[PDB]
Amino acid sequence: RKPKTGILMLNMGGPETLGDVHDFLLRLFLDRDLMTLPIQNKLAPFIAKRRTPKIQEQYRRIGGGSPIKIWTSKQGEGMVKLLDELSPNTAPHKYYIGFRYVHPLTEEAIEEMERDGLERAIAFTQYPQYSCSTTGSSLNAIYRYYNQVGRKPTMKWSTIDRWPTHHLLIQCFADHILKELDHFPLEKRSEVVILFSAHSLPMSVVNRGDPYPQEVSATVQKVMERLEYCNPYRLVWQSKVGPMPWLGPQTDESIKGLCERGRKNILLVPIAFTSDHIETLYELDIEYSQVLAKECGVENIRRAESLNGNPLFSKALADLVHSHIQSNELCSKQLTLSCPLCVNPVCRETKSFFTSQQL
Amino acid sequence: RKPKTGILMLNMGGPETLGDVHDFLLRLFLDRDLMTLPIQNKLAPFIAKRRTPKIQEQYRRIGGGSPIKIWTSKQGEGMVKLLDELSPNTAPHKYYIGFRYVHPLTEEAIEEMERDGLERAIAFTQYPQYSCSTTGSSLNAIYRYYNQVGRKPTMKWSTIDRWPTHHLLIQCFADHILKELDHFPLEKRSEVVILFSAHSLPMSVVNRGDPYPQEVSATVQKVMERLEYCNPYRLVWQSKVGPMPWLGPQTDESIKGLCERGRKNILLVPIAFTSDHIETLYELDIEYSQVLAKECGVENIRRAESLNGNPLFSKALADLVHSHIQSNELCSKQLTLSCPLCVNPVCRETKSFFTSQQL
Ligand code: HEM
Ligand SMILES: C[C@H](CCC(=O)O)[C@H]1CC[C@H]2[C@@H]3[C@H](O)C[C@@H]4C[C@H](O)CC[C@]4(C)[C@H]3C[C@H](O)[C@]12C
Ligand SMILES: C[C@H](CCC(=O)O)[C@H]1CC[C@H]2[C@@H]3[C@H](O)C[C@@H]4C[C@H](O)CC[C@]4(C)[C@H]3C[C@H](O)[C@]12C
Ligand SMILES: C[C@H](CCC(=O)O)[C@H]1CC[C@H]2[C@@H]3[C@H](O)C[C@@H]4C[C@H](O)CC[C@]4(C)[C@H]3C[C@H](O)[C@]12C
Ligand SMILES: C[C@H](CCC(=O)O)[C@H]1CC[C@H]2[C@@H]3[C@H](O)C[C@@H]4C[C@H](O)CC[C@]4(C)[C@H]3C[C@H](O)[C@]12C
Ligand SMILES: C[C@H](CCC(=O)O)[C@H]1CC[C@H]2[C@@H]3[C@H](O)C[C@@H]4C[C@H](O)CC[C@]4(C)[C@H]3C[C@H](O)[C@]12C
Ligand code: FES
Ligand code: FES
């Protein structure tokens, strides 16, 4: 039977093999939205060529590539399976992967969905907390696609642009935190400090009004309320790059600061991404937890397991789509408000693309 | 009969009259935990003298003084009437006002509480969201008092150091937002953009690990969930002073930014303070919502009423103290964790002061 409802899972993605690193970076330094460089059409290929060696080396340290596609596919298969039983009126359901910087690209996914003659398409961001640099970029790509291809969508669109406090996402995080707490020696369990870590943002982005920090913060509170405030905590930020000011505290400085102040039992919790990637496997596990940890002498530092293939996460994904469908919403109320200091004209067009959908 | 349980309501305070300004600024500039100045004992008095006129002028624009003590007293009286009925066993309760920088000073209040021969003392911060610069400072003052007077307390201490998501606090905020939305012309009600505004912090404080931003963000989320996300919103920050980097977006820049982008119906919501003060009466009402709103024609800009004398807020206070008593807690779990990059030696001693209290 023909696919009726399409679910486009959006993520920035990552290179599957070391050889995909160059093109991954090239597309990154070419995204007019997220970056502005003089004659960016010539600087990009150059910069990409320069950073490739260093980035390839990071992925080599974690096994040779990104596992995002593998986990995305599995979560997607589990979601569809549940949806066909949750919403028969919109079945059969089919998931598509739309990576912003690697294959399958957002554009390629859209072409395929259109080919499958779907009745409705749902842009489902895999980023629970909204950032104009992540979900916004992916949504802009959908608008730009149809605008460039000079055509109108043959299917009905709508978007699940954020879900920072979905009860099942919160339950998943809490469950992974609790089981990681069981791996610390029992005599130090209540002494453990929880560090929620999320990818940072340059202060120029935070200062224009990006929704991200406030939403990541909201996720942290829900998770801690569910854990009944069993351990003390702080929300810190990682992955800062360059000489410009980024939102802090920085995760690495915090780990080291805590140790120097007698808190040597730390639990790291990636609270802003749903699966393993360079941020957790390399940055946290290798850069920090190993080298940095082997410094100021930590007693125990562990990292909560990423959601990955957790069956309960697949249920969360399905419940979100199901609720989205019965709600008949086109996008969140939050998407109807661009950054108070937004200076990108595509943002407004993208918003209208969704709020203006037929039906 | 004599008071059995004392509730010390902590706030930074504000000058009652124009004449109290100078001493207000002086105590501020002499505080070593908040400010490091060369030959401070020399400069402090001087700077105080220089900035007094400019700040007296600000208070003159709002009536000649701060109403903080009036509202704090009203809230305190209401809280006590309820406590005496909610917790008969904790005999008569009495509230004391402990302002950090104005009379009645924290020290003076503690002196009176101990003169009253109280059995139990509760350091109740009036800041829902914890900041080392606000609640932290007030708690440090309690510890320093006993360390200075070279004696130990004659009362059993404990603290309510934060309550960012208390259900009744949330209901009060939501109720005031809704009633204010009713004051907008009906045709622009759903077009209204909600700007939650909280006092900002220097990025140097944020980057050391201050809990404030994340807690303020948590309060915004609960208020919006209770409002069922009826309108779009953003959390912005006000009161920045100086050339250094502070956490943005800045409230004024956001108001101007929104207008220039077609969103001319705005509802300001002071989300980090419980009563009117210089921040709302002067900053938001005068320098922003009046002048700023005279360059880029705004259609409607209103400000939700501060909690002030709302009866439901007195009930929230009483409920917090009552729950605190029934739980036997000495402080939140969060206070047992100082900033990852904390560089103030007193912070650890202050926390120990509370976690080590008898019984
Ligand atoms: C808000 C502004 C942001 C900027 C400017 C930014 C910038 C960048 C840049 C330049 C890279 C390439 C770094 C390199 O090649 O060494 C990168 C990679 C990446 N970013 Fe972002 N990013 C932002 C936000 C985010 C967010 C919110 C996430 C979500 C977790 C994220 C996740 C990643 C990941 C997973 C990579 C791949 C790194 C690698 O493969 O080595 N980024 N980002
Ligand atoms: C001036 C511009 C900042 C853009 C802005 O206003 O935000 C910055 C951003 C990217 C920078 C470039 C990239 O970092 C790549 C190169 C790095 C080299 O060390 C200097 C030249 C180099 C070619 C940089 C020149 C200049 O500092 C750039 C072009
Ligand atoms: C780290 C990287 C330099 C690559 C390299 O030469 O090794 C540089 C090149 C382009 C830079 C970006 C661009 O200058 C655009 C943005 C400028 C903002 O002030 C900070 C974030 C911002 C998004 C920059 C982040 C970072 O400094 C980048 C990504
Ligand atoms: C250098 C120091 C910053 C402290 C620090 O954060 O490291 C700043 C804080 C207070 C400043 C002083 C106060 O603003 C008072 C004076 C203001 C005058 O315009 C300049 C001299 C003046 C006497 C300032 C000298 C210098 O800029 C000071 C002393
Ligand atoms: C009044 C003075 C402004 C100097 C001037 O331009 O005249 C400002 C500058 C820094 C301010 C302080 C800082 O923002 C730190 C604290 C922030 C809290 O929300 C209130 C007390 C608090 C301790 C502030 C008191 C007062 O508003 C200060 C001291
Ligand atoms: C110490 C703190 C953070 C410094 C930083 O960002 O590294 C800074 C930020 C804002 C500063 C204050 C503001 O600039 C307002 C006042 C300016 C006067 O010249 C000195 C006192 C004054 C009240 C400053 C004291 C101190 O330098 C503050 C409080
Ligand atoms: S950059 Fe946030 S809406 Fe445009
Ligand atoms: S400055 Fe935050 S605990 Fe010391």
Side-chain angles (χ1 to χ4, degrees), chain A residues 87-313:
Chain A
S87 180
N89 292 309
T90 54
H93 300 80
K94 182 181 179 184
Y95 80 87
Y96 300 73
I97 296 182
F99 285 150
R100 188 80 183 84
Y101 305 118
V102 295
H103 295 292
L105 293 166
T106 317
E107 296 67 27
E108 311 185 305
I110 294 177
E111 310 183 17
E112 195 190 314
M113 296 176 80
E114 216 111 61
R115 296 171 68 71
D116 291 326
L118 300 165
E119 301 211 306
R120 66 180 290 181
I122 302 180
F124 189 178
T125 189
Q126 292 312 302
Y127 290 94
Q129 305 97 3
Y130 190 94
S131 175
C132 299
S133 69
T134 54
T135 300
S137 173
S138 276
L139 294 182
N140 288 345
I142 300 171
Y143 160 69
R144 285 222 187 70
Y145 173 75
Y146 287 101
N147 188 242
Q148 170 169 166
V149 86
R151 279 185 281 173
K152 160 70 184 176
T154 57
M155 34 190 205
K156 181 280 213 64
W157 282 90
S158 67
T159 177
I160 294 175
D161 53 290
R162 72 199 74 196
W163 37 290
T165 64
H166 188 270
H167 67 112
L168 293 176
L169 171 77
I170 301 313
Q171 197 180 325
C172 282
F173 278 134
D175 289 351
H176 283 201
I177 290 178
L178 287 176
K179 75 181 180 60
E180 200 60 26
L181 281 179
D182 274 303
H183 292 153
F184 279 87
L186 178 53
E187 60 268 39
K188 279 157 175 38
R189 194 229 174 77
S190 50
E191 162 58 35
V192 175
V193 171
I194 305 175
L195 277 183
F196 289 91
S197 189
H199 192 128
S200 186
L201 304 193
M203 288 304 297
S204 61
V205 169
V206 172
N207 290 331
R208 67 188 184 195
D210 195 294
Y212 183 70
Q214 185 282 320
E215 299 199 339
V216 172
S217 294
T219 304
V220 171
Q221 202 70 27
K222 294 281 186 287
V223 171
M224 288 311 309
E225 305 192 326
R226 193 193 174 74
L227 295 169
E228 291 185 84
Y229 302 100
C230 59
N231 293 77
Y233 72 85
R234 282 292 195 292
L235 167 55
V236 290
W237 321 80
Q238 60 182 105
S239 310
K240 153 194 169 194
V241 292
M244 305 308 283
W246 285 60
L247 179 57
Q250 300 178 194
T251 302
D252 57 358
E253 298 189 320
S254 300
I255 293 184
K256 183 169 75 70
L258 283 176
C259 286
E260 305 200 322
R261 294 172 179 61
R263 307 311 294 263
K264 303 175 179 297
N265 294 95
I266 306 174
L267 175 56
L268 308 179
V269 185
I271 197 65
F273 205 79
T274 59
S275 76
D276 279 310
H277 55 328
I278 191 67
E279 280 182 50
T280 62
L281 300 180
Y282 180 73
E283 239 199 298
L284 296 179
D285 298 350
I286 295 181
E287 283 197 305
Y288 311 154
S289 295
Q290 294 189 184
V291 185
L292 183 56
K294 288 283 76 63
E295 178 203 305
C296 38
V298 307
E299 305 197 309
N300 300 99
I301 184 165
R302 308 181 71 80
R303 178 178 63 72
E305 180 182 3
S306 295
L307 307 195
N308 296 333
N310 188 157
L312 186 63
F313 180 54

Side-chain angles (χ1 to χ4, degrees), chain B residues 82-135:
Chain B
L82 301 179
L83 283 178
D84 288 340
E85 305 295 310
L86 280 166
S87 181
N89 298 312
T90 39
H93 309 73
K94 182 184 176 186
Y95 78 81
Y96 299 74
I97 293 181
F99 286 148
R100 186 70 179 68
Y101 305 106
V102 290
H103 298 300
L105 293 168
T106 315
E107 296 69 31
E108 310 181 313
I110 288 178
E111 202 167 303
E112 189 189 312
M113 299 181 87
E114 226 149 60
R115 286 192 176 188
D116 277 311
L118 290 171
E119 266 176 43
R120 178 170 189 167
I122 302 179
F124 190 2
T125 184
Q126 294 309 303
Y127 293 95
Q129 308 93 5
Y130 188 95
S131 180
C132 298
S133 307
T134 54
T135 301

